[PDB]
Design a protein around this ligand. Sequence first.
Ligand SMILES: Cc1ncc(COP(=O)(O)O)c(CN[C@@H](CO)C(=O)O)c1O
Ligand SMILES: Cc1ncc(COP(=O)(O)O)c(CN[C@@H](CO)C(=O)O)c1O
Ligand code: NA
Ligand code: NA
Lengths: 387, 387
Amino acid sequence: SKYNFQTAPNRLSHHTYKWKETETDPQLLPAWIADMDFEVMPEVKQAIHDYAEQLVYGYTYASDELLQAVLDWEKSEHQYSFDKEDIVFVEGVVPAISIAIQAFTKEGEAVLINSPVYPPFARSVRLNNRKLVSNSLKEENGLFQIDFEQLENDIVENDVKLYLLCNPHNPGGRVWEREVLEQIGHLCQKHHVILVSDEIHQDLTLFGHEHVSFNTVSPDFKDFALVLSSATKTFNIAGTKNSYAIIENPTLCAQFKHQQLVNNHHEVSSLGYIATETAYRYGKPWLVALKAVLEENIQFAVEYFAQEAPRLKVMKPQGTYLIWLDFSDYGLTDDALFTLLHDQAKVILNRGSDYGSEGELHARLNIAAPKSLVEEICKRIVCCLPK
Amino acid sequence: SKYNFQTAPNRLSHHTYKWKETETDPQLLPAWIADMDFEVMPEVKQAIHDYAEQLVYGYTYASDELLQAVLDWEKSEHQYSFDKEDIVFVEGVVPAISIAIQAFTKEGEAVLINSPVYPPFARSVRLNNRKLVSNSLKEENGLFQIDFEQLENDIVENDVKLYLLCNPHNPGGRVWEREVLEQIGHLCQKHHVILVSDEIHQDLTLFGHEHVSFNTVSPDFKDFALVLSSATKTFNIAGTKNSYAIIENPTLCAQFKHQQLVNNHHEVSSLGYIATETAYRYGKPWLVALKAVLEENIQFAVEYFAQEAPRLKVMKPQGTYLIWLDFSDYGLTDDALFTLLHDQAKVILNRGSDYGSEGELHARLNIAAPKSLVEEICKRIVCCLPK
Ligand SMILES: Cc1ncc(COP(=O)(O)O)c(CN[C@@H](CO)C(=O)O)c1O
Ligand SMILES: Cc1ncc(COP(=O)(O)O)c(CN[C@@H](CO)C(=O)O)c1O
Ligand code: NA
Ligand code: NA
């Protein structure tokens, strides 16, 4: 218990998204947006104090030490070896997604996602005036799976140019096996599709599930695929605004960097650089401790819901700290479910329908909070469900 | 008991752009990129420490207190009154310029600048595949002036859609009079041109020169013009990454915000928000003290160069902390001037030619450093100039 996973810091004065509603209605307990109600690792807090003590807060660049820290993290944690020149810093992963869409496709061309998925995927495609192709995931034995026949159909019928892959997949928390990723890659090679693998949850695979970074699947995958990740989801530092793309293919790397500069989206803040380097240098023990806490919270929620709401269908995450809940067996509409949870149960969960039509009558639950808070949130979710 | 403008914090370990070359060649003295070698106001330092003590560094948004701080600053310092909903935060001004180009013009359409000017102006136009129209500034009696006859010709002959205005103008530090701004505005009305006024140096007008913010010139100007500014240049906090657009016209504001979201360039870091609010709420006395130091440094440089290098033509800034130096009386090429300053004099100044063809044989000198450092830099500049 060296690190504090037992007590949530009070965030009410910090202008957070997560606790905003609670500031007006103190009864509301938020468990929606993916940041954590855990204190950040102490080395990052110290690094922010140390930044203050620089005294001058001018223009800074991404250092060789930061580049090496990213290289070292990827090698040590994900067995992914590349060169410092392959790293492109971006203030966030969602920014990187828009840059990729703009760099690798033209207006009107088709971009494929596996639905239901993180809403900025569909939004970034549509707002960019690209054609969205939603490849609907199957649900079998409590897990999402890809229908590869329909995936190929979706690619061919729509002349898909870009595939935005989520790995681990949010929502659901699906940690794709190497064999699944290999089939995806072969389809991209066949049909000349560029693949962007959003691996922001890569450090949060649980219960023995192992993240397989996309370009580690086959040595040639870097010819068409790039990887996005960050320290921010792993270490709860989203407000520091830094992330990266690993782009080993020279042409793809130049294309991305060019579009990033066209958009004047090439700079990152000083603390963005500092916090990522610090997290990667010092964060491993904290991450190990976090993952044990997350596993306990998830197991608790699954068992509690099984006992108190056996009609509630719970997808057990293989990774991420987010649980996908299916209220389909209840006599509720999508809107009535939202009103029930928010107004009667006083719990704020993400509306599943935000993620696509497959999310109708679902909600997403964030369990990256102390066990006592998770216990209360689960109690509230089961309190008011209709007979 | 008073603010420190006498000693410069050591920056060699902070991965700064400004001191980067000096990290490898200790002989080199930088006076190029516009950040200051002055300690930032103490309250911003404290705000960074306070941010560390939030303990959780998750997702945040722009608070009503920050919005009010910007409103209050704009009203009290620039007599510019508008509503909180007119403010759009962007991680930087150069980001905002690209968003504006993309939002308000189509590919192939013409964008006008007054050359020579801050290089990202020309770059952002060119990289965006817009046609660049450079309206060349006159130089008369040591000051840049607009040729309004040619400006109108440039607008009409090229069907200009967007005018990127720099006010105060960098380089040269020209603080455009109200009457000059009114003539520009009237041309934009006549010819249906949208105008973006980059007023990042607005708080740094000197020697009795007063900034006139563009939309304060006429109540009609908001129909076609928006204002970009920031706390970063004023208060030496560029690394914190926040700035704003004031867009009073509903259509222009929606267009800008839409494009910002298309580009996923809508979020700002938590410290970005914090540092700007803090600077505006506590910064005025520091700024008053700064301006006295800057005037002293500029006066020193002008007089020193007048004695030690009478052939060197020095444009005295009306604002900004940057001096535009003209070496055209010397038997030098643009390349030879750069080599002389950098390799013999051991000083790093911005290359004038970066700013446009009018900057050939020029260099830009940054005097926002302690007087003792400025004295040394000036001594170096005059040491090795050829007969
Ligand atoms: C697949 C994926 N890609 C990107 C991000 C966020 O990226 P950014 O913070 O780097 O922009 C998230 C976090 N998503 C959070 C925050 O919105 C959530 O509530 O789901 C994500 O799940
Ligand atoms: C007219 C103008 N607009 C914008 C900026 C910087 O804007 P940003 O840092 O907010 O993107 C500057 C600072 N310019 C610095 C940093 O490059 C200089 O050395 O000139 C500027 O002079
Ligand atoms: Na659908
Ligand atoms: Na020119």
